[PDB]
Amino acid sequence: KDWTQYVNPLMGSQSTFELSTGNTYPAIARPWGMNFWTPQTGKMGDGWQYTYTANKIRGFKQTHQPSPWINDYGQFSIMPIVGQPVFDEEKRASWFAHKGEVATPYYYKVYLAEHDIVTEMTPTERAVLFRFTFPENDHSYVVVDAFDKGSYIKIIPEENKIIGYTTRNSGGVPENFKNYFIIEFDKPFTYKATVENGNLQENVAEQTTDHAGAIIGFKTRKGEQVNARIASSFISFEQAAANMNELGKDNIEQLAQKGKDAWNQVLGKIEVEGGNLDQYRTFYSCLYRSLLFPRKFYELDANGQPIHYSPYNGQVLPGYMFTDTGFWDTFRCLFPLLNLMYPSVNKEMQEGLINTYLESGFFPEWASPGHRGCMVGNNSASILVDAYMKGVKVDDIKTLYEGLIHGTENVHPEVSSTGRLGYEYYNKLGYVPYDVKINENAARTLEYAYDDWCIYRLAKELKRPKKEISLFAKRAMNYKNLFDKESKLMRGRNEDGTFQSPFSPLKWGDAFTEGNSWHYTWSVFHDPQGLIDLMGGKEMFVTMMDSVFAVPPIFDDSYYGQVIHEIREMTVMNMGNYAHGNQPIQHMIYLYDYAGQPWKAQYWLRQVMDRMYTPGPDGYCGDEDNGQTSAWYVFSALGFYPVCPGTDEYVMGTPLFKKATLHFENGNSLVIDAPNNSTENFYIDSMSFNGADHTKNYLRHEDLFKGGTIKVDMSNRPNLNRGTKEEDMPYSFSKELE
Ligand SMILES: O=C1N[C@@H]2[C@@H](O)[C@@H](O)[C@H](O)[C@@H](CO)N2C1=O
Ligand SMILES: [Ca+2]
DSSP states (O other), rough: OOOOOOOTTTTTTTSSSSSSSSSOOOOOTTOOOOEEEEEESTTTTOOOOOTTTTTOOEEEEEEEOOOOOTTOSSSEEEEEEEEHHHHHHOTEEEEEOGGEEEOOSSOOOETTTTTEEEEEEEEHHHHHHEEEOOOSEEEEEEEOOOOOSSEEEEEGGGGGGGEEEEEEOOOOOOOOOOOOEEEEEEEEEEEEEEEEETEEEOOOOEEEEESEEEEEEEEEEEEEEEEEEEEESSSSHHHHHHGGGTTOOOOHHHHHHHHHHHHHHTTTEEEESSSSSSHHHHHHHHHHHEEEHHHHHEOOOOSEEEEETTTOOOOESSSOOOEEHHHHHHHTHHHHHHHHOHHHHHHHHHHHHHHHHHHHHOOOOOEEESSSOOOOOTTTTHHHHHHHTTTTTOOHHHHHHHHHHHHHHHHHHSSTBBBBBTHHHHHHHHOSSSSSSSSSHHHHHHHHHHHHHHHHHHHHHHHHOOOHHHHHHGGGGGGGEEEEEETTTEBOOOTTEEEEEEETTBSSSTTTSSSSSHHHHTTTOOOOOHHHHHSSSSHHHHHHHHHHSSSSSOOTTTTTTSOOOHHHHHHOSSSSSTTTTTTGTTTTTGGGGGGGGGHHHHHHHHHHHHHHHSSSSTSSSSSTTTTTTHHHHHHHHEEEEOBTTTTEEEEEESSSSSSSEOOOTTSSEEEETTTTOOOOOOOOEEETTEEEEEEOOOEEEETTTTOOOEEEEEESSSSSTTOOOOGGGOOSSSSOOO
């Protein structure tokens, strides 16, 4: 049974700076591939490296880029051509169309109109096989671009080989950073020239220069297939040569199929049925996107043991290592999806995190490949703890604990988004002041508070001294310190203790991060009852939640000086202030469950699943962000969501398919049966879990792992009585102390 047929790698590529519909590129790769490959439409250096609207392809690129904002490293490209041998990235470019293009997660094909050449490629974790089909011609060449900012290239004719290294990067790299690559052709060169800063140097074997390049060529007869075996490494040329064995002796088709099996082996852990083709495509495309980042950043040694170039100190060290994720996005539901469906993969990730801390002094927040200055919060604490509480345990709990503590009282000296910016204020005043020139201070405060709740949880589980437990228990309630009784919202707070004036809840940025108070106020994943309590009780809380959907999408962009795409994205949806396009509010709807109106969540979640996700190139309503916006759909379509990582709970929403089946790593399975599900039947009239009636609005990790069957009675009417009792509510820190 093949699920790859549903995956559309182009979903997200019809995106512009002014309005995101995903901001993705076609990532032709294995699951968590160390090296992704992609057609390249944009010019070198542009974060929009492939846009669906582009007329021309200028190369086939090894890329690691996690987003057009973070940009790229370890990047070089290859491009077959005919006619004059040109290195220029514009002159070598060829028209193409999508009806002449085939994109799968394991295989990519395209017809380059102006060269009359077909290109195909199938990657492994670290290597890729290209096959170029050339027309009849005296002058057929292949261009190899090592990119600029200091690269290297050497042609080695007596082995039909080219080698090189690329360094162009967007920060986050040690001084010795290099991506080492090798390229073997199966046809001898009849022409060879290296390129040096735009200059063609025929029969000059090698260059070390700003922008190194190489062009090789030959005579071709009609339909002649030239294959290139490619691999790279962050360690060395000798390791790059070892990586090339990934390719075995396979040709395109045999590799494609091993690639397709690899993907089916992971997509197939979740089988959905009983929906339309749109839904299958949207679901499995989203699932695929959730299985890409963070990337493997280790390589296999001669004995098949994991080793890695540290992007933190530049040494080569044994053990796991991953990168290219921003925890500010991915703590929310992406890493949780991994603890549920792929625990053994996140095991390697956590081992990796431990290695990051040993090698750099901090657990990372945004990493690409080393520490990068981007976003806010200390949400690594949530990643680390949620894993552990879910049975994904690192070997060195001692180091784990120390690293957590370390980041609660240090910010990284060159990367302000690593450790906690403004911890001093936060540890003393219980919040980050609005007026001390630390932006996004209210956002930092609410996340730090949650992050401390997680640490509290781990302190507790580990039998730490009551004094560490208590200190984090207290800090966990730090969200109270920004709550404004009048507006019933969170609000920037001055160093002296007075709230900032004037206050606009519609202002984006400033106190908050790419959102406004209406988006950020809900960031109390560990204690919604505490937030209800703050607002005056469930009814008022509900009244506030409704407003988010009902108010016009007015805004205040002064902080940014332009209508950034996250704002635009929100405005166009006609969903009030509900900005699903950005991470901070993405859990909000499930909150209804906590106030005893689960039917409202069910309504709104289906509106989102139905309207805000489509399977085409313009598929998302905002940035995808490395699994987060996608895993959201995956979770929601199954019918529940990790509102609060660190707990063992998944908060109930409403399933999208008539039947979904989870195959867990432990050999057990779980069938979620919604036989009456339909376009109109989105309310849950009742549930049962293995014959036992289930009224609660949450599911426990441990129970799901046991397997069996959950039955969902779908209906078009809201059941005003199910899920309203105190015992039906998911976890809030305020409750407890019990
Ligand atoms: O301008 C940016 N938009 C996105 C953010 O919204 C955030 O989701 C990403 O982690 C982060 C990195 O992609 N981003 C930016 O820097
Ligand atoms: Ca975003």
